[PDB]
Amino acid sequence: QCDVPPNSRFDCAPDKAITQEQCEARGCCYIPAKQGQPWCFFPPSYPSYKLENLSSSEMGYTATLTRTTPTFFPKDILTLRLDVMMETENRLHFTIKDPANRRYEVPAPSPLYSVEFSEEPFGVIVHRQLDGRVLLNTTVAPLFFADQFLQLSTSLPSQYITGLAEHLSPLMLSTSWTRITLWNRDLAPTPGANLYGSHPFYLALEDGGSAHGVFLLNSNAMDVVLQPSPALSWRSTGGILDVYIFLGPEPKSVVQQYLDVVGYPFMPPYWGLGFHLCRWGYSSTAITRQVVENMTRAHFPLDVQWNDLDYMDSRRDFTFNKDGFRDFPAMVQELHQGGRRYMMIVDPAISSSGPAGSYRPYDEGLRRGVFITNETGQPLIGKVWPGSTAFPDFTNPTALAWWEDMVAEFHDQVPFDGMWIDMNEPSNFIRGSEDGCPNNELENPPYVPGVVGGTLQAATICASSHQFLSTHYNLHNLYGLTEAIASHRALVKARGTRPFVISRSTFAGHGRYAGHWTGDVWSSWEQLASSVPEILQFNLLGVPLVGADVCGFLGNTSEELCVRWTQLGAFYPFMRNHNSLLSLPQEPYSFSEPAQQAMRKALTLRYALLPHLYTLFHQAHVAGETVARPLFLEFPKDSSTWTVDHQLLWGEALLITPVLQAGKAEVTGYFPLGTWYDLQTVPIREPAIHSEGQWVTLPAPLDTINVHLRAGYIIPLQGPGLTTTESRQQPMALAVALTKGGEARGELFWDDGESLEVLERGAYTQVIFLARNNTIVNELVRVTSEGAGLQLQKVTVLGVATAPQQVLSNGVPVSNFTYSPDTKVLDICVSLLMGEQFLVSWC
Ligand SMILES: *[C@@H]1O[C@H](CO)[C@@H](O[C@@H]2O[C@H](CO)[C@@H](O[C@@H]3O[C@H](CO)[C@@H](O)[C@H](O)[C@@H]3O)[C@H](O)[C@H]2NC(C)=O)[C@H](O)[C@H]1NC(C)=O
Numbered sequence: 068q069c070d071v072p073p074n075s076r077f078d079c080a081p082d083k084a085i086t087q088e089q090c091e092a093r094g095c096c097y098i099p100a101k102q103g104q105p106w107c108f109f110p111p112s113y114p115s116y117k118l119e120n121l122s123s124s125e126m127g128y129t130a131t132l133t134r135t136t137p138t139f140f141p142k143d144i145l146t147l148r149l150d151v152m153m154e155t156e157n158r159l160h161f162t163i164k165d166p167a168n169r170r171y172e173v174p175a176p177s178p179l180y181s182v183e184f185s186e187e188p189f190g191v192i193v194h195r196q197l198d199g200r201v202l203l204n205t206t207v208a209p210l211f212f213a214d215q216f217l218q219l220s221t222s223l224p225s226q227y228i229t230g231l232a233e234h235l236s237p238l239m240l241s242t243s244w245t246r247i248t249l250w251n252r253d254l255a256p257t258p259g260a261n262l263y264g265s266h267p268f269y270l271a272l273e274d275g276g277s278a279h280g281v282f283l284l285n286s287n288a289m290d291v292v293l294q295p296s297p298a299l300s301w302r303s304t305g306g307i308l309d310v311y312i313f314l315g316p317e318p319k320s321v322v323q324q325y326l327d328v329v330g331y332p333f334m335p336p337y338w339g340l341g342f343h344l345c346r347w348g349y350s351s352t353a354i355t356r357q358v359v360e361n362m363t364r365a366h367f368p369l370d371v372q373w374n375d376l377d378y379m380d381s382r383r384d385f386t387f388n389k390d391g392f393r394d395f396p397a398m399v400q401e402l403h404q405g406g407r408r409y410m411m412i413v414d415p416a417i418s419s420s421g422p423a424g425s426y427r428p429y430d431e432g433l434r435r436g437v438f439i440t441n442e443t444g445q446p447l448i449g450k451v452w453p454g455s456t457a458f459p460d461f462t463n464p465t466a467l468a469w470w471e472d473m474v475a476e477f478h479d480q481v482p483f484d485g486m487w488i489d490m491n492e493p494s495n496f497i498r499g500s501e502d503g504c505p506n507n508e509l510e511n512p513p514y515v516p517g518v519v520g521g522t523l524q525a526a527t528i529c530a531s532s533h534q535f536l537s538t539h540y541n542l543h544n545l546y547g548l549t550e551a552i553a554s555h556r557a558l559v560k561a562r563g564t565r566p567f568v569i570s571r572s573t574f575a576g577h578g579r580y581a582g583h584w585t586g587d588v589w590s591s592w593e594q595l596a597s598s599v600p601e602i603l604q605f606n607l608l609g610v611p612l613v614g615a616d617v618c619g620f621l622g623n624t625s626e627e628l629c630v631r632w633t634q635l636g637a638f639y640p641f642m643r644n645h646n647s648l649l650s651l652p653q654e655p656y657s658f659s660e661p662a663q664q665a666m667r668k669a670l671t672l673r674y675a676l677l678p679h680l681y682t683l684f685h686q687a688h689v690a691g692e693t694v695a696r697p698l699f700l701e702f703p704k705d706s707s708t709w710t711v712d713h714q715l716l717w718g719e720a721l722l723i724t725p726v727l728q729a730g731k732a733e734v735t736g737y738f739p740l741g742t743w744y745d746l747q748t749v750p751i752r753e754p755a756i757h758s759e760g761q762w763v764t765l766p767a768p769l770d771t772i773n774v775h776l777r778a779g780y781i782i783p784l785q786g787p788g789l790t791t792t793e794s795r796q797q798p799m800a801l802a803v804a805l806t807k808g809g810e811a812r813g814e815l816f817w818d819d820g821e822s823l824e825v826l827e828r829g830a831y832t833q834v835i836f837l838a839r840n841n842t843i844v845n846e847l848v849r850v851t852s853e854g855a856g857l858q859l860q861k862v863t864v865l866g867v868a869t870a871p872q873q874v875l876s877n878g879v880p881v882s883n884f885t886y887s888p889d890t891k892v893l894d895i896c897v898s899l900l901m902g903e904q905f906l907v908s909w910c
Pocket residue numbers: 441442443444445446447448502503
């Protein structure tokens with residue numbers, strides 16, 4: 068009975084340090100590890116639930132689950148209801164609930180899956196129908212379902228699993244007895260720690276390159292434990308088991324299927340894809356204006372100027388000081404006059420210490436009962452930047468109305484273009500409240516997940532504090548998401564155009580409302596390298612508008628680190644350089660001339676690619692696609708890609724291989740089977756890498772980042788500007804990467820860059836580009852006033868093996884072309900319109 072292979076032992080003492088006698092008294096097996104692996108584990112006969120009265124419904128199954136022997140946890144729920152819903156051919160959904168009490172809940176034709184059930188011990192078994200592979204099997208360990216402890220386990224199909232944000236780790240999670248804690252926490256990113264957000268989703272790869280995803284729709288503090296058998300255990304401190312399985316079979320299909328439940332990514336405004344520049348320490352409008360002046364003087368693109376806490380009066384939301392920021396409104400109006408936008412920090416917590424009637428956000432918040440309350444029904448008071456603060460309850464419909472009013476009234480004073488919502492874990496400088504927290508089972512639960520500080524109260528507010536929908540215990544992991552939703556709506560009402568919200572704290576489904584940055588990353592080579600997996604991970608989780616602080620936030624960047632970080636950072640979907648109060652300056656213009664040139668080239672290339680990046684965001688928004696994606700999403704059948712997380716793709720076609728280490732003049736990266744053209748051969752070293760699926764060492768001097776364009780793809784480009792206001796007026800270009808057989812395909816999505824309801828109203832242009840048999844044509848999917856008059860002036864064709872004798876545009880010899888026999892590049896001058904059918908030919 069105790070003859071269980073070490074890697075298959077499930078922990079029977081997750082709650083406490085246990086002796087052999089206590090372990091055996093629990094009905095568990097005690098076998099010390101020979102050097103982590105649990106010493107106290109469940110025998111196969113450990114009491115679980117028994118399935119009874121399984122019955123077939125329309126859309127699936129229902130059953131009773133009965134536990135006859137209590138666990139070592141208090142308040143086992145001995146009778147459960149199982150509901151299985153076969154929702155689509157790709158999506159299976161099951162719940163396990165208490166039928167006697169409403170518990171907290173987060174607010175050939177055949178399916179790809181088959182489901183069967185173990186009776187005793189109870190388990191759900193999900194097979195992939197096509198190849199019989201076991202994807203889910205919850206029979207592997209007991210089902211625990213107590214008031215403050217849920218545990219469901221499964222076998223995994225492989226050692227390859229990704230998800231369960233937010234943590235600083237490789238894209239592929241370690242299955243070596245790893246405890247991953249989901250409890251939103253203000254902490255500078257470091258490995259093994261619960262960070263700002265919680266995404267209870269994983270994607271599991273299968274031998275051969277198929278994949279499936281599992282979402283547990285549970286917002287409680289949880290541990291997810293991975294062991295090398297391989298297997299996973301969800302361990303939640305409340306709510307219910309609400310489980311979705313997504314059958315893929317392609318990894319990109321798993322992600323889209325997940326996003327079909329939690330929401331497709333919001334469409335950002337075009338300007339939001341430009342360069343953002345911020346620090347804590349721009350302590351006046353004069354200094355802030357000098358940042359824009361200095362960037363402009365040195366020909367550095369900048370779409371958006373930001374301020375941190377500097378702008379506020381005594382670090383309070385919806386104020387500006389009358390010292391350095393007396394003329395704040397004029398500053399922002401002037402930014403708009405120059406074609407730039409403005410962003411500023413907003414904290415959730417509201418100063419509670421001001422004289423009554425002197426600070427409207429608090430005074431009005433008190434009147435309308437917007438704040439999280441304590442045992443006596445008064446506002447819970449903590450400490451953040453302004454001192455004593457109350458915390459808005461963004462589950463309260465009246466708090467939403469209050470937040471809309473405060474944002475709209477402040478926007479009437481200072482016409483900011485979005486909100487940078489920080490400290491929204493929610494972060495508390497003291498433990499729970501100024502008054503501490505009561506002694507109850509929510510504050511002191513029977514199972515505390517592996518959170519930093521060892522308590523649910525650490526760096527946040529009391530768990531038993533009251534919100535409109537439930538206790539903070541159940542809602543904590545949603546706090547940031549609820550603020551992001553409230554802020555999205557507030558910005559839609561205030562401005563009447565697409566909202567731009569960048570949030571620190573997140574939850575599953577965040578990407579439907581807002582973007583994210585990875586928080587207080589050190590200015591280190593390690594954090595530069597760690598940013599690639601984390602940006603890729605957020606893309607898999609439907610938050611494609613993500614990036615890290617370019618050059619790092621904490622400490623002092625070096626010039627070499629800031630060159631490499633700007634080079635990589637230019638391929639973050641959200642690109643912002645941000646810097647701490649105590650740091651040396653790190654604006655592009657603050658470095659040596661050669662570092663400035665490298666940084667200017669990185670920004671120039673990003674601005675040139677913006678029509679492509681915007682089209683990739685359109686695909687995320689309409690089809691649940693990733694923007695930044697790991698190689699394994701695009702080449703899943705090549706198992707060499709599975710562990711690659713220091714390279715990224717933009718969409719299907721652009722491979723970025725950054726230097727992530729000091730003192731390097733070369734980088735080794737994986738090239739999937741195919742031809743990869745060096746983007747340096749496109750007017751804005753091997754001209755083409757011919758790969759069989761192999762590692763290639765590339766030259767990568769300090770002034771260089773390796774970027775390759777996949778053969779078979781066409782990229783739309785636009786001319787330069789220091790803003791997207793300027794760049795969107797420039798003529799466009801195509802980069803056409805031919806296959807050996809002379810084929811390529813690409814597309815362009817164009818709209819006005821900021822209106823709401825564009826796709827519903829049809830207020831966009833959509834064009835497909837096709838290369839075939841020495842011709843390039845456009846195919847007009849939709850042509851409207853927005854995009855019709857886009858000028859195409861240049862067509863660069865890569866992989867043209869012989870010099871053409873003639874190049875025609877609509878049947879007429881072109882004004883000029885150049886052909887380079889060394890690089891096999893054909894560069895063609897044209898005068899065409901994206902929205903009018905053209906034919907470019909050569910021979
Ligand atoms: C629920 O939250 C409220 C605040 O909204 C807490 O009120 C606080 O209660 C303490 C006493 O328990 C007050 O401390 C007292 O302050 C006065 C001076 O103002 C001092 O003379 C007393 O010796 C004592 O320190 C505190 O002022 C008050 N805070 C505010 C903002 O009024 C309440 O205690 C919370 N309830 C629980 C059970 O946590």
